[PDB]
């Protein structure tokens, strides 16, 4: 499935793949942006 | 029929042999599993590729029980 992560209060995406009906409605895994470094990532 | 199908050749094997100079990174051996093992100055990667970790000559160790290893004996 097409899942494109997004940075909070900013603008930066990421390579992903959510799963269909499988237990996964919202994802909140960490990462590492360009501007500054390390910030929580919500789905959307 | 229902046959005549196949997957392209994967060209794997010992790439450097015992007593060849090699630079760092040189793929030493490409392999189906751990038909060989790393060892001295010799790393290995996702596929099981073994590769020099410093320039130097290669050598092959048999160790029975423990399996076969490959190393670079460095020098400069």
């Amino acid at each position: 499935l097409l899942l494109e992560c997004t940075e909070c209060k900013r603008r930066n995406y990421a390579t992903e793949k959510n799963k269909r009906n499988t237990p996964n409605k919202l994802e909140l895994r960490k990462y590492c942006p360009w501007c500054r470094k390390h910030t929580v990532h919500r789905e959307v | 029929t229902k046959n005549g199908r196949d997957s392209q050749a994967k060209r794997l094997g010992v790439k450097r042999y015992e007593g060849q100079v090699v630079r760092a990174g040189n793929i030493l051996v490409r392999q189906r599993g751990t038909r060989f093992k790393p060892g001295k100055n010799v790393g290995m990667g996702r596929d099981f590729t073994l590769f020099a970790l410093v320039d130097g000559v290669v050598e092959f160790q048999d160790r029975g029980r423990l399996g076969r290893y490959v190393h670079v004996r460095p020098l400069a």
């Binding site: 097409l2 390579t15 992903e16 793949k17 | -």
Partner: protein, 63 residues
Amino acid sequence: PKMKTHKGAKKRVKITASGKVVAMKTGKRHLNWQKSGKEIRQKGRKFVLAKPEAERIKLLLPY
């Protein structure tokens, strides 16, 4: 009478001051999805051609 430059190539290939022919790497516009950071990072840059490189130059002409 005066060969015309091949615009298609102009539009996608530079001929370097020494004489090389540079292009953008293929494979980085939608096969894309999950491909290692490495994968698509590596696709980011230009490369150098070979025998077609000579074919290439033949078009880019008054160019």
